[PDB]
Design a binder for this molecule. Structure first.
Ligand code: ANP
Ligand code: MG
Lengths: 155, 309, 141
């Protein structure tokens, strides 16, 4: 599980780095300056670029979901790699808007023993909120997870 | 024609660097160069490579192409070109399955170039070895300089010496990735190119020569970076990509920040840094070979580049 | 430990030493000085840090995005430390600087564990760097 999680995270990180890379900004800036016969070629490029963008976004979402699932499974399958809970939380906090990630944390992350989340308890508590309550919301899952951890280790 | 002349000198510097190293001088790893003499901002004159024929003219010629002569039952060059253009405005998965279908009915026949021109086994082996060394040396140097638009009509092969000659060097420094159809391959290593290397393929002479060339490039990083720095700050060197050039290249029927980014990208290449990690010469060469021969990357490429060829 | 992540270099008097290795610190190590146990232990510690670069980088990433973690310097804090009678780009730059430290990159070149340790020891014990420092740090001590 850990090996698949590391590779899936690496692929997701590479895609994320490409999106924030200066090369991507330069390529995007070329199309914006180009759009400012002539109109036919311009409207095509504004269609292929978004077609490439949606495919890249879908690939990033698939890699992110697979990495999160494998990280949860690795945590549930042993204790030697408990330190990787930081990566699982880092993906979860930075992608709180994804419904799939929040659902997997609610369905499978609640089976993870609470004592693994104690070392990073400060950051989990600092992300508590109310504006985005919901059944699949990040805040409700975070609140339920934080409460459950406080159940086992109040001290 | 000034841009071509500038690229020729870098090839001379790459040739000069390769000559002074015993590892590459023994293998005679050199780059074919032709004199370019610009005469104005609009017209110029350049050397004509006598005894050379385009690889596309030899392979996929409509009348007497290599594919037609050796594989009459396979798909014609026109048929493969038409199919790729149809799937251009389609999904990526549809593009991939079309590319595999075309490649299934299009087998490389480029290995016959040396067989029909050099009947003597001793001469044939020498020409094939020279061809493999020429491709390996040009691919590594082209990757280092970010050479792009390496389609069939931009590559010349010498009939007498079987050495590849690269022309139309206007696109460089990874400006090909900025095109509407990005260049996802560092160099051209299609099935025809690999097929002409022998039964061993990329393994053997090609891989060792690529590693030896990369070691020379890595060992001369301070020299190579300095030369490119001089070029990138030339006021008359219009190496940056513009919409007019981008649309012309792919047609169908702050300067300082960019130069610094290119220099940084060149520097990480010379140190073996590809995705933020340090890679050895062997590891970097393997990554470059894998990326060039990856069918998925070839599917995304422009049909005019003739990835299937 | 309020000051971290090279935020001391942003101070009006920059911190030119990675750590405190003054004459008193070296003198207490014995006649051998930095050579021997100190140098080997520093190399062993650096190897562990390098071997766990992905782990260390992941942890710091969680810390730097904490909304309540006020690790960045402000003019009020800078004057308080030295007194006499976009957050995202700042977060990313520290991560990149931390990443190059974990991989041995110091001035754009790849340095081994032994080479990196030697550079750190030389910088800390360099008298020229100690002279520029704030006397309240007591470099001579
Ligand atoms: N230096 C050369 N030596 C031999 N043949 C050459 C040389 N340069 C071009 N050719 C031939 O000319 C053909 C056309 O290429 P070229 O002269 O570059 O015009 P082009 O295709 O329009 N390039 P460009 O003007 O940049 O779009 C090639 O396929 C070669 O057969
Ligand atoms: Mg051409």
């Amino acid at each position: 599980f850990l090996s698949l999680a590391r590779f899936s995270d690496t692929q997701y990180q590479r895609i994320e780095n490409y999106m924030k890379s200066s090369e991507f900004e330069n390529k995007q800036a070329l199309l914006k300056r180009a759009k400012e016969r002539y109109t036919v070629k311009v409207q095509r490029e504004l269609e292929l670029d978004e077609l490439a963008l949606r495919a890249l976004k879908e690939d990033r979402k698939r890699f992110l979901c697979k990495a999160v699932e494998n990280y949860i499974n690795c945590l549930l399958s042993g204790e030697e790699h408990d330190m990787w809970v930081f990566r699982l939380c880092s993906l979860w906090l930075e992608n709180s808007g994804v419904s799939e990630v929040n659902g997997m944390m609610k369905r499978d992350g609640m089976k993870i023993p609470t004592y693994k989340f104690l070392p990073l308890m400060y950051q989990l508590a600092a992300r508590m909120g109310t504006k985005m309550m919901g059944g699949l919301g990040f805040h409700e899952v975070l609140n339920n997870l934080i409460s459950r951890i406080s159940m086992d280790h109040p001290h | 024609l000034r841009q071509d002349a500038v690229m020729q000198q870098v090839f001379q510097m790459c040739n000069t660097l390769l000559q002074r190293n015993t590892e590459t001088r023994k293998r005679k790893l050199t780059i074919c160069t032709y004199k370019v003499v610009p005469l104005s901002q609009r017209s110029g004159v350049l050397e004509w490579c006598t005894g050379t024929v385009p690889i596309g003219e030899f392979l996929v010629n409509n009348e007497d192409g290599a594919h037609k002569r050796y594989r009459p039952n396979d798909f014609s060059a026109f048929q493969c070109q038409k199919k790729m253009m149809e799937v251009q405005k389609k999904s990526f998965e549809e593009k991939y399955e079309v590319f595999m279908d075309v490649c299934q009915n299009f087998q490389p026949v480029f290995r016959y170039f040396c067989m029909e021109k050099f009947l003597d086994p001793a001469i044939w082996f020498e020409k094939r070895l020279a061809y493999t060394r020429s491709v390996a040396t040009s691919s590594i140097v082209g990757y280092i300089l970010g050479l792009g638009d390496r389609h069939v009509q931009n590559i010349l092969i010498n009939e007498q010496s079987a050495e590849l000659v690269h022309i139309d060097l206007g696109v460089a420094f990874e400006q090909g990735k900025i095109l509407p159809t990005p260049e996802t391959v560092p160099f051209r290593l299609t099935r025809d190119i690999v097929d002409g290397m022998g039964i061993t393929g990329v393994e053997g002479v090609f891989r060792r020569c690529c590693e030896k060339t990369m070691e020379v490039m890595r060992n001369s990083q301070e020299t190579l970076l300095t030369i490119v720095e001089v070029l990138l700050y030339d006021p008359l060197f219009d190496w940056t990509m513009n919409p007019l050039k981008a649309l012309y290249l792919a047609q169908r029927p702050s300067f300082n920040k960019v130069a610094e980014r290119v220099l940084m990208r060149l520097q990480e290449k010379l140190k073996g840094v590809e995705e933020g990690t340090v890679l050895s010469v062997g590891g970097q060469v393997n990554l470059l070979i894998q990326q060039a021969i990856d069918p998925k990357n070839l599917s995304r490429l422009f049909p005019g580049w003739k990835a299937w060829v």
